[PDB]
Write a protein that binds this ligand. Structure first.
Ligand SMILES: O=P(O)(O)OC[C@H]1O[C@H](O)[C@H](O)[C@@H](O)[C@@H]1O
Ligand SMILES: O=P(O)(O)OC[C@H]1O[C@H](O)[C@H](O)[C@@H](O)[C@@H]1O
Lengths: 915, 911
């Protein structure tokens, strides 16, 4: 309430200084009018907003939309600092609290909590899902605005530093305001990778050694007189950027080669900085004999020649500084590692050998562990637990490639390739065969040692990309890659085909093949698919007791309902874990969940809690998708929270699991799921005029204009634009549609079922968490806004259909609140609700702004009354506005497209979610 | 006794955990007896302390001497943090804002007069590798970390987990410094002492200059100036002697100078690259000039749409609607060539990359940056241009393409050596035997002549070769990497003219300005005459173009005469030289060669600037920052901000609000005691032959070279100033600093009893006389004749201690009259804390004083029997064998060196 009024004060001053007082008063007037809608429910205020926002000059319209976008963004920044400040004060969920509670209350011993941590691993998978509506220029400014705002509220600073810190804050807000918010060109898969990797640099790299040090501090406070072994990778980091090519033909085999090399050069660069700092630190002389002989071998083998362009340690290092002798050799091999990567990237050859550089992580760890052992054996274990222990943990966590790259392609793309092989040879048509026929042939071919892939094989452009990707996988080192994920996996022949196409393409060390069950049917037959794979002798010899399976929270919610998909994913996880335990396999589940509730999003410790008991056991992978990367790792503060949340919630779920559902609960969920999906699909799939309404009532067709990603009826739509359209209108149709029908069906089947619905919400964590998130969504909902879009853009014949959907909204919210114990939305949580009451008037302004602009774009002859210009800069019509001409040759009249894009970015900013 | 007790309580714990409890309380028992010597004066206890320091095992003697050294170091770190925390509280020694307010309101200058003064001010801080830094760079690195942990451990809002983790880091780095070899086993190269000095330019000075200029701008705002200080105003410059001063150092070769010049140019390129690609991300605005628009479209068109796959950011071509990124992207690639071209010249001697591909001048670099600045301003975005862009522009004007400008220094006789070889080989005669008037007319005829002089047939020694080869290297390297050519022990205008000719006859196509360094008393007395002779010859006036720079040495003048007479002639030299310069219309810039110790002209920066005569600075001054002082003034960020502010504020106040000139009575008295003080000084150091034998007996002067501080490898005038001061500082006697002052004061009182009130009047009113005496009492605070009397009783011969006690009593005498002139009850009355910093350190200093004298005894006296006692350290002799071939028996050299570093740490000064 004070951080917010501070930054908004600075912005409105910058606005008045640059464009005059009229543009400032207008923006403030919009807030007051919208504040009366939000505060009273006066639907006539929306017509008042519509009146003002129509008729503006093209430049003023862009400036109005951009100002509100920046103020909503500033409001977000003001809240991120406020919660950080409150979390700090609350310490004057935690990993030390979780360790204490796990020893004192649930009664586990410190040693079995120690043993649990040493076997835990949470892999966080960065993906470039097109959800980051803010360009990196603007995000970079947000870091400095938050940094200024934090230092500005220390009780330590002088009046003069206070005066300079605000001047820097005002100039950073101005720098963002005068930047083109609209990304005028589509990004490159290499650009998306760099955006993800930037968080590995600025936050994650030094983040996880600081977090691993806290884990040791927590272990010491529960009696463990021992550090967590540095080979324990509590957190690992993977990437989809450059590897996932599902429906992205711009992700080429060249692109994957690029990101693998560029990441290896980045890793060498960060290792260089750490080794140079370590060279200066370890100036001791006492060392083990094994290092004493190694330091004398290196000092003798290398001639006493100088390197005049080295800034430190440019002469031969004396042997009485053994740790510098050993690390100087590591530093020299690292420089070769960096530029050998540099050369391969520029032109795929290098003068620098592989023997002169680091090729394996054992090669890199060997001298570093020698220094650690050496220091310990002289009683210098305290010195070895400093920067050296940090680095040793960084190598086990990041390796030579910084992150491991998953590869993802869809199943029918492999079937296309194998059918080509069988058709080109004499065998027949792999596409026409039954599923069991395919499993029979693939196993006869994997067992047979005769090659299959013919050199003269005719290839489409799609078949060439699939094979070329596998060729790229064979060229680059195996430690640069994670698994090969099958999008749209349905049956074991999908997994076996990739296993064969891998070997038939020269992958000497094949990646693990992970199926991604994304739709409802695929998830229903998922434990059956896993079982028959586990019953094949060849496949069990290949996986060696380790299996990974991915579940897709996005496309499954889009196929069925939210409630149905949520339930089926619970069962798929549960029955697959049972299949794997019967067959003696350690299953690792890969949760592909996005930022929004509709795509599997929600607080980390709550999403882990809703997962079936005894299906994690210290081995889990989760996708951090697009804008979520900023949400979790945009600043050191946040990275420490994100690392602590995943580590604590994964450890607690292991030793202290949640409850399994009662048999009556399961039966109710199974029947409610059927009713939910039928109700969902009756509106989304069966209703003929749905997509016509859906394209009228939402800004779906404009999502691509934001230029977020590299990807060049409802069946064809992606999940992110799907959720996006219904989050922009604050309707959130896919997130709740069906839950109303399932709840009614349950209580009209039996009135007592209302009492078991209340028992499930109070006792079943999966149920509480699922329905708690639905409440949080209805908090961010407003049927009045959906009604405004219906009125301005939806044809009259479809208006009764829209009102039907708003009726299902109101009855679903009525229910869910009554199954919960609450009077109204968000009782026992007022801070988030306070953050809503302050952001909402500016979102409502943009909602009215977006709707009326869409009307001006679709109806080119919608009459408006021109208003006098508001900005002093573009007030005189001599020559056109630079702001308007930033989009030359637009498909829409001047200013409308830019105005529309800014409302989409601003609503996403206020909603704190894009899709 | 807060941070102090903290820092040692951990060290004492780390010591016991590694070496056992007996060694722990042995060093505490050493504090026991010495603390009671300081709290009594019992000379009995020093012999008692010496009794058990003697018999220690060789490995234990090293550990004890090192343990005291690390605790005295920790006591200094705790003092540094306490001071910084106290200064922080005093804002919740003048601020730059307070100085601007005082100059406007009290003194009554207009804010525009203050503004116009600041725009014309330049304080050049000259980093030198003078051999004063006793600590290894590895140890200095850990001292910064220990101060960092100790600071964060006292924050107002840190958790208990954050506190205990910062504690573990504090201990593991107290232990990492303890288990490091404190002794530099090999003598450093000149290219290494360049590294040491340039490390501070990286870690605090680079970002500190634009931060301080930022505070100068807010100060200007709060006195009514609604304008930023122009970015082309170089309020603070930085020069270097490292790799440039070669006087007395034959290891500073012409190749060494070439190295540090190109290496600095590479470091400059590295820092600019980081700032540029950082600025690349920041300047994302689209509004720009007409001139920037045309520029951005010119380069976007002329640049093919190639990509650079190894660029982390901006790896594709940049769109022309991001104009600032287009220009800065070209700047970035031109800087990458500049860095690599310097790398190639440094490794080999040639580069594939052209000069046309890189930045060869400040103007070439500034043109794109100033275009962006004017562009942002013309679009109403001045507030953006004043962010990172202004900081970088200020960094260019402050540091340039070489980061620091190098100064070259060689002594006058080395130049006369070469010129004598020329005339002898040509048959002109002997330049060495000509009178100075003849020398002037000959060189002036050769400078006016067009015929070459230096024959390639010239027979050369190694020294005459070093002089010419150094001039050759000056001709090869770019002019913007050099400052002035400085002449050590300059005496007369021919020394200046000799260098002027040698420069031109060695092919220096744009000659360096020649600066005389007047280091000895006789040279300073004739210095206004030498400057007037140079200002009166038409050739030299046409060359210098109304600007002259003269260096005055504080180290060698205090060694020639006394401290009183040096400081007074230095006052008169500056005073009369400025009067000569004003008569001839020349702007004179004084270069003050000040050291760390008071004996070599050291002291608080704002106090030293106040001591200088009025109307001698006027916004143009250069000051040396020598060796260990570089750490004192720039070791951490708040120290750099403090140093820049003192120099800026003191210099600015001196110009518009000068000190008072001395009264005629004050001058005459000052002149008369200068004669009496010098006569008293020369009578004990020059006259009396046994002074040398006493000196080398009672001080550890003969082992100062064993610390391997610098790269510098007979009689008494042959000793250099730093070992001279270092010797009397370790014995806590400080003879050179106060010698002639005692005879001077009594002479004034006995000549006339009324002079006693005149001495008091000068102390109350005259800033020069007040600062000079105030620095003396601080020296006496760190002085103790008992320790000097110790060293005598063990090491000096019986015939000489009558002489030693005579000096000991003129110490006590001068201390008496100095306190009576100051009107102070005791030493350091109103400075309570930094006197309580003495009461904590001095027990430890006294144990090492006894350790030094007794160790020196067993070295010079191989006969002195000592009874070995059982070892203390549970580790034991690997620690001994870090010194393989020592001239002395096992452990005594290492113990003697650890001693020297310890006292240097406790005294907070080396030489
Ligand atoms: O040896 P120290 O004084 O601790 O300095 C540490 C290092 O500093 C620089 O890098 C020098 O070039 C090295 O030769 C030296 O070893
Ligand atoms: O354009 P933004 O999203 O602000 O990203 C800023 C820049 O990021 C990377 O450096 C890309 O290579 C550039 O093409 C992009 O301009």
């Amino acid at each position: 309430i004070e951080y917010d009024a501070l930054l908004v004060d600075r912005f409105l001053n910058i606005l008045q200084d640059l464009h005059g007082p009229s543009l400032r008063e207008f923006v403030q007037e919009c807030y007051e009018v919208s504040a009366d809608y939000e505060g009273k429910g006066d639907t006539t205020k929306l017509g008042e907003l519509g009146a003002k926002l129509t008729g503006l000059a093209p430049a003023d319209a862009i400036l109005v939309a951009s100002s509100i976008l920046h103020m909503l963004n500033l409001a977000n920044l003001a809240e991120e600092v406020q919660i950080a400040h409150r979390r700090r004060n609350s310490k004057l969920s935690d990993i030390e609290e979780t360790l204490k509670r796990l020893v004192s209350e649930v009664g586990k011993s410190p040693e079995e909590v120690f043993e649990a941590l040493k076997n835990q691993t949470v892999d966080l998978v960065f993906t470039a899902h097109p959800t980051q509506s803010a360009r990196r220029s603007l995000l970079q400014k947000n870091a400095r605005i938050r940094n200024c705002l934090t230092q500005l509220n220390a009780k330590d600073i002088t009046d003069d530093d206070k005066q300079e810190l605000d001047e820097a804050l005002q100039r950073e807000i101005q720098a963002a305001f005068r930047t083109d918010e609209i990304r005028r060109a589509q990004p490159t898969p290499q650009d998306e990778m760099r955006y993800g990797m930037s968080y590995i640099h600025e936050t994650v790299w030094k983040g996880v050694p600081k977090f691993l040090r806290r884990v040791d501090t927590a272990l010491k406070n529960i009696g463990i007189n021992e550090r967590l072994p540095y080979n324990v990778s509590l957190i690992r980091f993977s990437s989809w950027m450059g590897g996932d090519r599902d429906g992205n033909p711009r992700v080429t085999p060249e692109v994957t080669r690029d990101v693998c090399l560029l990441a290896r050069m980045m890793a060498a660069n960060l290792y260089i900085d750490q080794i140079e700092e370590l060279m200066f630190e370890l100036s001791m002389w006492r060392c083990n004999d094994e290092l004493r002989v190694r330091a004398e071998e290196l000092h003798s083998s290398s001639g006493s020649k100088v390197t005049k362009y080295y800034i430190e340690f440019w002469k031969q290092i004396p042997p009485n500084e053994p740790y510098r002798v050993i690390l100087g050799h590591v530093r020299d091999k690292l420089y070769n590692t960096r530029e050998r990567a540099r050369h391969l990237l520029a032109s795929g050859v290098s003068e620098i050998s592989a023997e002169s550089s680091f090729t394996s992580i054992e090669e890199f760890l060997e001298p570093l562990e020698l220094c650690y052992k050496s220091l310990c054996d002289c009683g210098d274990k305290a010195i070895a637990d400093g920067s050296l222990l940090d680095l040793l943990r960084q190598v086990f966590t990041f390796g030579l490639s910084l992150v491991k790259l998953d590869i993802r392609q869809e199943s029918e793309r492999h079937t296309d390739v194998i059918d080509a092989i069988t058709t080109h040879l004499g065998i027949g048509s792999y596409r026409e065969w039954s599923e069991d026929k395919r499993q029979e042939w693939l196993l006869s071919e994997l067992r047979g040692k005769r090659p299959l892939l013919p050199p003269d094989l005719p290839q489409t452009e799609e078949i060439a990309d699939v094979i070329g990707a596998f060729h790229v996988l064979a060229e680059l080192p195996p430690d640069s890659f994670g698994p090969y994920i099958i999008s749209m996996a349905t049956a074991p022949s999908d997994v076996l085909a990739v296993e064969l196409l891998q070997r038939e393409c020269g992958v000497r060390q094949p990646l693990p093949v992970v199926p991604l069950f994304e739709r409802l049917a695929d998830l229903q037959s998922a434990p059956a698919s896993v079982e028959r794979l586990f019953s094949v002798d060849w496949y069990m010899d290949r996986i060696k007791g380790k299996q990974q399976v991915m579940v897709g929270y996005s496309d499954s919610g889009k196929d069925a309902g939210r409630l149905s998909a949520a339930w089926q994913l619970y069962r798929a996880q549960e029955e697959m874990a049972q299949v794997a335990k019967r067959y003696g396999v350690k299953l690792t589940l890969f949760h592909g969940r996005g930022g929004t509730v509709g795509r599997g999003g929600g607080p980390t410790h709550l999403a882990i809690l809703s997962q079936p008991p005894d299906t994690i056991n210290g081995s889990i992978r989760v996708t951090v998708q697009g804008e979520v990367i900023e949400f979790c790792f945009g600043e050191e503060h946040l990275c420490f929270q994100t690392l602590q949340r995943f580590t604590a919630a994964t450890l607690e779920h292991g030793m202290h699991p949640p409850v399994s559902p009662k048999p009556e609960w399961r039966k109710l969920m199974d029947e409610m799921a059927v009713v939910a999906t039928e109700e969902y699909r009756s509106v989304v799939v069966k209703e003929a005029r749905f997509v016509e309404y859906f394209r009228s009532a939402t800004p779906e067709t404009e999502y691509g204009r934001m230029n977020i990603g590299s990807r060049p009826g409802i069946t064809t739509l992606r999940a992110i634009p799907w959720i996006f359209s219904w989050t922009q209108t604050r309707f959130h149709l896919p997130v709740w549609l069906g839950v109303g029908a399932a709840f009614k069906f349950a209580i009209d089947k039996d009135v007592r079922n209302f009492q078991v619905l209340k028992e499930m919400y109070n006792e079943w964590p999966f149920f509480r968490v699922t329905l708690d998130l639905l409440e949080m969504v209805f908090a961010k909902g407003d049927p009045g806004i959906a009604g405004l879009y219906d009125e301005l853009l939806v044809a009259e014949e479809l208006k009764p259909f829209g009102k039907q959907l708003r009726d299902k909204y109101v009855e679903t919210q009525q229910l869910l609140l009554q199954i919960a114990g609450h009077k109204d939305i968000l009782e026992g949580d007022p801070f988030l609700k306070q953050g809503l009451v302050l952001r909402n008037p500016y979102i409502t302004t943009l909602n009215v702004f977006q709707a009326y602009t869409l009307k001006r774009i679709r109806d080119p002859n919608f009459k408006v009354t021109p208003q006098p210009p508001l900005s002093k800069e573009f007030a005189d019509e001599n020559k056109p506005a630079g702001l308007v001409k930033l989009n030359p040759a637009s498909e829409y009249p001047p200013g409308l497209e830019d105005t529309l894009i800014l409302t989409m970015k601003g609503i996403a900013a206020g909603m704190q979610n894009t899709g």
